[PDB]
Enzyme design. Sequence first.
Site, short mmCIF file in Angstrom:
data_model
loop_
_atom_site.label_atom_id
_atom_site.label_comp_id
_atom_site.label_asym_id
_atom_site.label_seq_id
_atom_site.Cartn_x
_atom_site.Cartn_y
_atom_site.Cartn_z
CG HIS B 44 0.29 3.45 2.44
ND1 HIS B 44 0.42 2.60 3.50
CD2 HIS B 44 -1.02 3.56 2.11
CE1 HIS B 44 -0.82 2.20 3.80
NE2 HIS B 44 -1.70 2.75 2.97
CG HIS B 46 5.62 4.35 4.75
ND1 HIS B 46 5.28 4.21 6.07
CD2 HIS B 46 4.64 3.70 4.06
CE1 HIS B 46 4.16 3.49 6.14
NE2 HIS B 46 3.73 3.17 4.93
CG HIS B 61 1.00 6.77 5.10
ND1 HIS B 61 -0.35 6.58 4.92
CD2 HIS B 61 1.49 5.63 5.66
CE1 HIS B 61 -0.59 5.34 5.36
NE2 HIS B 61 0.45 4.75 5.87
CG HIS B 69 -4.62 7.40 5.28
ND1 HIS B 69 -3.49 7.01 4.60
CD2 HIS B 69 -5.59 6.49 5.10
CE1 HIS B 69 -3.81 5.87 4.02
NE2 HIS B 69 -5.07 5.52 4.30
CG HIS B 78 -1.11 10.85 3.94
ND1 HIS B 78 -1.29 9.73 4.72
CD2 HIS B 78 -1.34 11.92 4.72
CE1 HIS B 78 -1.60 10.18 5.94
NE2 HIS B 78 -1.65 11.49 5.94
CG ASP B 81 -2.62 8.18 1.59
OD1 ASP B 81 -1.68 7.59 2.24
OD2 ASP B 81 -3.39 9.00 2.10
CG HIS B 118 0.61 -1.40 5.73
ND1 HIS B 118 1.11 -0.99 6.97
CD2 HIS B 118 0.96 -0.44 4.86
CE1 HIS B 118 1.68 0.21 6.75
NE2 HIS B 118 1.63 0.58 5.49
NE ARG B 141 5.26 0.96 9.05
CZ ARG B 141 5.71 2.18 9.14
NH1 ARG B 141 6.94 2.50 8.76
NH2 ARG B 141 4.90 3.16 9.56
CU LIG Z 1 2.08 2.25 4.54
ZN LIG Z 2 -1.70 7.84 4.18
#
Ligand SMILES: [Cu+]
Ligand SMILES: [Zn+2]
Lengths: 151, 151
Positions: B44, B46, B61, B69, B78, B81, B118, B141
């Site tokens: 994603h 961020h 995000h 999400h 998001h 995403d 992730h 992360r």
């Molecule tokens: Cu993420």
């Molecule tokens: Zn998200």
Amino acid sequence: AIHAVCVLKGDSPVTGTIHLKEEGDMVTVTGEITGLTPGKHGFHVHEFGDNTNGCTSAGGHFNPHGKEHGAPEDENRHAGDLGNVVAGEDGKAVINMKDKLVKLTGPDSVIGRTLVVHVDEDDLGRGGHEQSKITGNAGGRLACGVIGITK
Amino acid sequence: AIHAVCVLKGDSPVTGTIHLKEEGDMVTVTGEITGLTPGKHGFHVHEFGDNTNGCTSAGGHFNPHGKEHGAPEDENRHAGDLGNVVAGEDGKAVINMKDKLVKLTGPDSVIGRTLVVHVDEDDLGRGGHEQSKITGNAGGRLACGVIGITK
Ligand SMILES: [Cu+]
Ligand SMILES: [Zn+2]
Ligand SMILES: [Cu+]
Ligand SMILES: [Zn+2]
């Protein structure tokens, strides 16, 4: 007010965090850089936020107006020309400056560009070397980081 | 066309370079991430380009439109995403996607923001966990980088 931050690292022991914020009509740049030899070290915004080849892939000084390299107080300067940081005898330099050409929005924004701290002093365009009006003859790159948006 | 790049590193062996470019009306995201456990890993944009506290200081995000999400194909997602990357048995994932909500200019630009990969799979909002509609329950992360301007 936009806020940004930059975490410096490179092929050296030099580290530090730089904060940038809009404040009135200028951008205020603050922070500490450590691990430096005592004395002046060049410090600039470079064009590219590109860390694929260490600090080398940051490219040259950010220069959207096509000027020569100069001192921060000059009209004929790169937008990225922040002069020198001054490391004390303990190897630590602290920044606290206000600049009118660094921007955090608009066509000259430095978001997503790079800060670099150099091996040598930036001669401010006045050193009499071929690189003076290009880079300030500041030599190699100790550490760099991409300028990012923060809270 | 704007071009950007992101070099991922973190508290893991995971590395990789992601390229982003405007292409037609979307942004094309390409690159390879290595050192991953085989299978799906959340991926994603961020909100913050802030590496002062590892990948944690990247924040959540990127969500300028105040959505839940979701999956990349969803309306209720998001802006950040991008779903999952899929690491092969050799631990390497390759990206090649086109996205309509990722932007490299304008109010929703991701320049100066962060890409994160992730520990776990992103459940796309559908996993039935408290974090599903927040993060996709993608866990910690592995690596991240600030999205920077490149040539
Ligand atoms: Cu993420
Ligand atoms: Zn998200
Ligand atoms: Cu420089
Ligand atoms: Zn310069």
